[PDB]
């Protein structure tokens, strides 16, 4: 991408904070390369990060800012999901086609399909978005998709 000045400044700021947390030394642990990019408003897939150099565990490989910038510009290229992509996908699990999916099914999809999420991450996101199910124990996936796409500060 043709990153501007302001954006490389935002990148440097995030890198610095992250370099501070695993111990200030002008380097950032590669296992944290993905989270750095999320702080900058990007939603990369794990496969996307491992491909730009991300590692699988803390204490393996570290990164100076110069090597980050490229990895970043790289993750900026990868495909970002839209609202309509998410609805169609959820629509595939919606038999009645009403906009409902049981809490259990929602948890199943997030924890067992695609790049799985853990049960703690699902509990956390459910609480943060304040997603609650009706008496049948079903949810309105369209609202949930909206809450996630809107961010922690709507």
């Amino acid at each position: 991408p043709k990153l501007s000045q302001d954006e490389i400044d935002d990148l440097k700021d995030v890198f610095e904070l992250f370099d501070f947390w695993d111990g200030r030394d002008g380097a950032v642990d590669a296992f944290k390369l993905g989270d750095v990019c999320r702080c900058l408003g990007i939603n990369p897939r794990n496969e996307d990060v491992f491909a730009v150099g991300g590692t699988h565990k803390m204490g393996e490989k570290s990164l100076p800012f110069e090597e980050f910038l490229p990895a970043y510009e790289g993750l900026m290229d990868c495909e970002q999901g839209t609202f309509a992509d998410y609805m169609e996908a959820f629509k595939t699990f919606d038999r009645e086609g009403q906009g409902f999916i049981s809490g259990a099914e929602l948890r199943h999809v997030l924890t067992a399909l695609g790049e799985r999420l853990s049960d703690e991450d699902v509990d956390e996101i459910i609480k943060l978005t304040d997603l609650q199910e009706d008496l049948e124990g079903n949810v309105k996936y369209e609202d949930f998709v909206k809450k996630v796409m809107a961010g922690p500060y709507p």
């Binding site: 501070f20 947390w21 695993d22 111990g23 200030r24």
Partner: protein, 139 residues
């Protein structure tokens, strides 16, 4: 520094043995050996050299005043610890605080760690930061 000063005046008159209003090498060498453990004849020179001018109570406060300058208040430091205690239990897990001090920010080397937790108030694996804060700030 207000309540401290007077205390620093009684002390000053206790270090000044020959009672003359000026702390000299002999003044220190005598009070030190008196309460025990005096500095090396070269170490005494350093303590005085830190005060470019005869050492009266004014120069005395000056060196102390400028040494205890810069630090944050007790509330600020107490509130810095509170940022890692979400439950507001007024304690930090021993493993957690050590983890924070040694492996993050400006990493403490192994001696800073030893000197920090040597007299640190710890019980049941919990670090009492409010007590440790009162302790760092003189109390």
């Amino acid at each position: 520094p207000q309540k401290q000063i007077q205390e620093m005046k009684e002390a000053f008159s206790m270090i000044d043995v020959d009672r003359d209003g000026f702390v000299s090498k002999e003044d220190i060498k005598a009070i030190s050996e008196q309460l025990g453990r005096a500095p090396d004849d070269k170490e005494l020179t350093a303590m005085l050299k830190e005060a470019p001018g005869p050492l009266n109570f004014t120069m005395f406060l000056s060196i102390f005043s400028d040494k205890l300058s810069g630090t944050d208040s007790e509330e600020t430091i107490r509130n810095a610890f509170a940022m890692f205690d979400e439950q507001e239990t007024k304690k930090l897990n021993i493993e957690y605080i050590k983890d924070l001090l040694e492996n993050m920010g400006d990493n403490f080397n192994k001696d800073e760690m030893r000197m920090t937790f040597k007299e640190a108030p710890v019980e049941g694996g919990k670090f009492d930061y409010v007590k440790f804060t009162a302790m760092i700030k003189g109390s």
